[PDB]
Amino acid sequence: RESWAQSRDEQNLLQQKRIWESPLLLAAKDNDVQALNKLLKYEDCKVHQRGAMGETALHIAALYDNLEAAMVLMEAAPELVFEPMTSELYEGQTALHIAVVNQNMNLVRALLARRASVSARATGTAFRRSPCNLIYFGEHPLSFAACVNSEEIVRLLIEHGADIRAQDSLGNTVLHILILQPNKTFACQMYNLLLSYDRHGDHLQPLDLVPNHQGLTPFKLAGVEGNTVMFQHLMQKRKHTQWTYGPLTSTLYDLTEIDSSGDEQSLLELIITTKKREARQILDQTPVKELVSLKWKRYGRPYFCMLGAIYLLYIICFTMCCIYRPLKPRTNNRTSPRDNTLLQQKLLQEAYMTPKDDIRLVGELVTVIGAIIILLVEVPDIFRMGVTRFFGQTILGGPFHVLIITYAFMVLVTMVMRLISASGEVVPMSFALVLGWCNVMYFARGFQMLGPFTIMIQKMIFGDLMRFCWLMAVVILGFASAFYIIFQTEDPEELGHFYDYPMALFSTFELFLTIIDGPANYNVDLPFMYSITYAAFAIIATLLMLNLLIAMMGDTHWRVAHERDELWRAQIVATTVMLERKLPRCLWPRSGICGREYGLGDRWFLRVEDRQDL
Amino acid sequence: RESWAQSRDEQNLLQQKRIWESPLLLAAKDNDVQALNKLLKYEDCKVHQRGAMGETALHIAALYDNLEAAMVLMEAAPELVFEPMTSELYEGQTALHIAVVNQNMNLVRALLARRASVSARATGTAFRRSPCNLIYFGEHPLSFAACVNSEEIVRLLIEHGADIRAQDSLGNTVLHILILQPNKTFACQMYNLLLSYDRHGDHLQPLDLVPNHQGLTPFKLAGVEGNTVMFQHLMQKRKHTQWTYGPLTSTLYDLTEIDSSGDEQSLLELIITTKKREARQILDQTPVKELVSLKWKRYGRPYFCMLGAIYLLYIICFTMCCIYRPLKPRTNNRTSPRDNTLLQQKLLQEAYMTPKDDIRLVGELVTVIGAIIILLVEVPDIFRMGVTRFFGQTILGGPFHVLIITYAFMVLVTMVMRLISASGEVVPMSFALVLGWCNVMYFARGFQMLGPFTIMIQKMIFGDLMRFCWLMAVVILGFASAFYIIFQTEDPEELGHFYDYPMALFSTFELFLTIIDGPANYNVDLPFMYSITYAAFAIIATLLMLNLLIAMMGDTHWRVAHERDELWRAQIVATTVMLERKLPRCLWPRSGICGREYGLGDRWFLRVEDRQDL
Numbered sequence A, B: 001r002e003s004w005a006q007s008r009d010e011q012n013l014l015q016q017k018r019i020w021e022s023p024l025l026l027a028a029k030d031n032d033v034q035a036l037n038k039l040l041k042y043e044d045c046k047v048h049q050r051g052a053m054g055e056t057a058l059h060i061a062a063l064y065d066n067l068e069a070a071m072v073l074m075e076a077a078p079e080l081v082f083e084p085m086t087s088e089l090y091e092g093q094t095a096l097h098i099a100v101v102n103q104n105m106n107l108v109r110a111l112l113a114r115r116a117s118v119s120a121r122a123t124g125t126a127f128r129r130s131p132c133n134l135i136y137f138g139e140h141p142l143s144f145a146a147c148v149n150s151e152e153i154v155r156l157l158i159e160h161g162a163d164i165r166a167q168d169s170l171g172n173t174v175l176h177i178l179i180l181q182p183n184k185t186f187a188c189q190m191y192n193l194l195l196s197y198d199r200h201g202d203h204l205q206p207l208d209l210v211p212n213h214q215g216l217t218p219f220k221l222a223g224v225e226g227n228t229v230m231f232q233h234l235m236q237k238r239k240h241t242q243w244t245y246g247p248l249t250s251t252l253y254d255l256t257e258i259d260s261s262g263d264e265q266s267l268l269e270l271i272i273t274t275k276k277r278e279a280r281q282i283l284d285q286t287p288v289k290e291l292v293s294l295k296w297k298r299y300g301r302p303y304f305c306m307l308g309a310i311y312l313l314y315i316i317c318f319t320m321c322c323i324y325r326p327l328k329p330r331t332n333n334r335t336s337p338r339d340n341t342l343l344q345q346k347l348l349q350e351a352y353m354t355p356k357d358d359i360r361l362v363g364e365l366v367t368v369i370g371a372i373i374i375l376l377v378e379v380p381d382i383f384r385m386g387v388t389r390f391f392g393q394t395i396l397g398g399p400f401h402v403l404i405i406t407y408a409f410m411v412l413v414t415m416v417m418r419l420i421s422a423s424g425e426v427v428p429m430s431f432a433l434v435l436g437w438c439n440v441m442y443f444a445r446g447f448q449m450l451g452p453f454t455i456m457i458q459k460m461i462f463g464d465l466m467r468f469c470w471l472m473a474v475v476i477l478g479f480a481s482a483f484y485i486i487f488q489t490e491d492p493e494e495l496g497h498f499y500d501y502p503m504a505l506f507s508t509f510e511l512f513l514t515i516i517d518g519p520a521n522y523n524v525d526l527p528f529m530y531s532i533t534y535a536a537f538a539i540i541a542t543l544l545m546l547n548l549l550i551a552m553m554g555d556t557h558w559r560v561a562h563e564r565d566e567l568w569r570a571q572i573v574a575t576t577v578m579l580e581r582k583l584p585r586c587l588w589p590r591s592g593i594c595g596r597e598y599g600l601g602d603r604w605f606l607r608v609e610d611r612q613d614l
């Protein structure tokens, strides 16, 4: 958790004590090549002693890039280079690593010439990909050399038996490490160099078709981490051009790793299922934007709006089935205490025998069957994915996959409330209408006009109104309790705005939004400490809190106005792919033209053409 | 429609199969001039075979700019250059075209030297001016040469019999093609070169007075497409200067093609009758801004505001004629069921015999005659123009040409409702007053103060309030149905805010805008599921939806604040010209001074003078 930082830093301090109380090893921290020549020549002053992190005297000579003190330890001890560190923080790191990390060294001549091992995996905990190590350099020695942009070490290291195809404990190869580097441009140049040494290809999956232990090619990994620049360079192999015609030209894109091939994941699946921001920016690039906007124009909006009309037809025969709820006059003759009760219907229990009530038995049997169809296409998607996917990817957009569960759950209650004839049946029917109709708004994303205005709401309910509601809640029960002990010494027959304490909570909340009338009788003197504390209420309620909330809502609008126009194009892809998965193969043709008729293979293709002025 | 793209791209793939299964023709795609020399020398290996798009082996040698493979096909086949392509996509395109499109070639030496035809019209469907071809290059070979900015082909091609004055199937000449190019600056230079080769002028309409099949000169076409830069260069011939005097100077403008000459269209007519945005920017240029602002200052505002005072005097004697509507006491003695009906007048039918009611017979005969005058000056403008002109140019400004039809239509109803004495006569009179008075706002454009604030409304009613009204409509009948099944088990004598379902639709809509009081009785316990769902209503109604709508309305204001100040100057020209067309010649003098007194001709003129510091 947190004390792991408190144990890591003490290792760094403990090194400086072991570098201090050690005679030859402090001479290794400096040059001291006259003294370290003499400090070695003794009876029992062995070089295998280790500091805090389990480190030899050669490493310290390397870690402070002292070449003269390095070679004397090699000349006096030939076994010393075969020696990795043995801490739990650093582990398996040899002396070849550090001279490579310092990116400019002639010691890499010497350590290679004394037959160092170029396959020492450095799987210590200071090298795993986590947001606590500030580097991610991989494990192998040539993996470090590429990672710090030093070609002259890479060409030297590959010449003496370095294996390109060596993966890591994370599973990634040399080239996956190059994608998620922060210094993006210098990786793209040297990516071309590392690809060249793959020749003869080992007659199988040559270099950049191999997945990792998490299961991605280098091309797909460029998508998810959001490296925009490397995604440009990886399309250069994948596309190949056609005829050119003045300033007009046309190309073909490979497309074999974009759309859904089978049950395997696609790239467009991986883009929308991440929490990052830079990754979703990749949609506007030239071989993917054409694929999306063609996919939603000819097979999108028809099969979305026809899903829209069915669902609007569903609730309009649920609401019509609702308001014909059966009743009867009441038979208990104005029971528990009178004049402060008014209800007079007390729900009918089982009488359907009517030539009219048969029609509701159709309409009830419409919406209950509809509640079963909702639960059969979401509950199989809960168990197939993780449990934290629906609270998981909800920020892209996911309240609507929670509401339409709760809509189906409440309709499934009101038939259990009907089959045994309970009393309080107006509770789930009330939630059914408010949660039902607000899921019409799920279809308010396949339209340009009332599109991104929906996303502006979701980014504000889980936004400034959640921010405002707390400081609304603290004041609203502050003054209400201060109102309640004023009018408690009063008869509520006239100006009984609040007689009971769970009404002054409600009668102040209505008053805070100015949707009720403000308490006045004008006929009898309502008490004095009302009229001072009501005026002091209305200043910090109507004149301050209510319309500060429009000021910060106006300010928070334009500072996300460019982000929401990306959120919409992100949401429209996620509607397309989710619509793609459920529709069968008898509908929904695959996008783009095919092979097997043109001498291209089994892979599909897409073309596009444009003007490239000069 | 859309599958025409699905048939176009398959032609491009089918070419790559025909380039593949053809031995000499693939050798034409590369150079292969050693092999193609031998591939021709056979018995039956003729060169007239055609690929997918009906194309010969010379074209493929041209389309991949292979000069060596081009000349061997000419040397072995002299007839081969006389050969256009025969697809439906490309049609009539010869081998001279492609070497010209590639803009740098020595094959245009050779194809001309073997007597190619420089008048092969390429009227295939991949060359028509439509928003699906990314080019518009015209049809003729020198038309292509100018279009890609290569003078050295133009001077070569004009020297061997090229005809400048050759129009196209669209009707446009060489020079109309130069105006609507996208690379604007390079057209303006070479426009001067193409004008030079018109000499001897063919003693009639020399080069840039000829219209097209759509009917425009090059000067007027520069207006409508909105090419600002070419409009500067075309005024250089048209104006001619006068005396210069230090930093002060004065010029004259030609003006013979700006104002309305006769029944023919003017340029100012063509500017306001387009849907584009760049074209309406041309108004601020120096020979047109002076013409407008002088035209509206001395013959504008008088004949606009006098139209304003007549119309305000019209409705103020319609409203005065309205509220003296005749009545009587009622004679049916409180019919169909009592206490839930209140009306007590039941309109008088034909009695006008009164010394006072004669005055209304004047006032009724004022406004009915006024309704006839409205219909006699718009219905002749429907049939003379297209039917989709009033829904057509309405975005510039046109609701007011629809309302004042509907005003006249409703007043014409209420006399038919009077001549046969129907009952429900308050319906068209009510629409007459609300639609009548809102057409006073048509005159709110000839004033600086309450000017562009009108256009801010039209860009918002057909804007964010149309955006807001849908998500207002979905919630407003959501909660209302949820309110209706709560108070259905209640006697509406006390807190009968809504008893019937087409009142809870209305009583919630009033409540959503907080213009009613909020339901409270404080005396009898109104039910529990009200008070929870009312508070959850008011948060996403008064605190969220209502005042988000002011936040996005504040944000959408300043991002069109510069556009509306162009819309106003656009609207004021359209008021001037529409006022110009209807007023006779006995009024409204033509703008600017005349000829025939100064040795200038029959054309009119305008002058202006300014300072040109250094």
Ligand SMILES: O=c1ccc(CN2CCN([C@H]3CC[C@@H](c4cccc(C(F)(F)F)c4)CC3)CC2)c[nH]1
Pocket (backbone or CB within 6 Å): A399, A403, A431, A434, A435, A438, A441, A454, A455, A456, A457, A458, A459, A461, B532, B533, B536, B540
């Ligand atoms: O008695 C009750 C108690 C709670 C409620 C809850 N309603 C239901 C609808 N939304 C909820 C659920 C959906 C979610 C939401 C609403 C509107 C628009 C969006 C979005 F995402 F489209 F912006 C999301 C938040 C509150 C407002 C309150 C009604 N009635």
Ligand SMILES: O=c1ccc(CN2CCN([C@H]3CC[C@@H](c4cccc(C(F)(F)F)c4)CC3)CC2)c[nH]1
Pocket (backbone or CB within 6 Å): B399, B403, B431, B434, B435, B438, B441, B454, B455, B456, B457, B458, B459, B461
């Ligand atoms: O019972 C009804 C039913 C419909 C109506 C329609 N009115 C009529 C007037 N405008 C309409 C028509 C004009 C148009 C408009 C109004 C004001 C200002 C402008 C503009 F263009 F100047 F901004 C345009 C839109 C709604 C509001 C509603 C009234 N009464």
Ligand SMILES: [Ca+2]
Pocket (backbone or CB within 6 Å): A516, A517, B516, B517
């Ligand atoms: Ca009130």
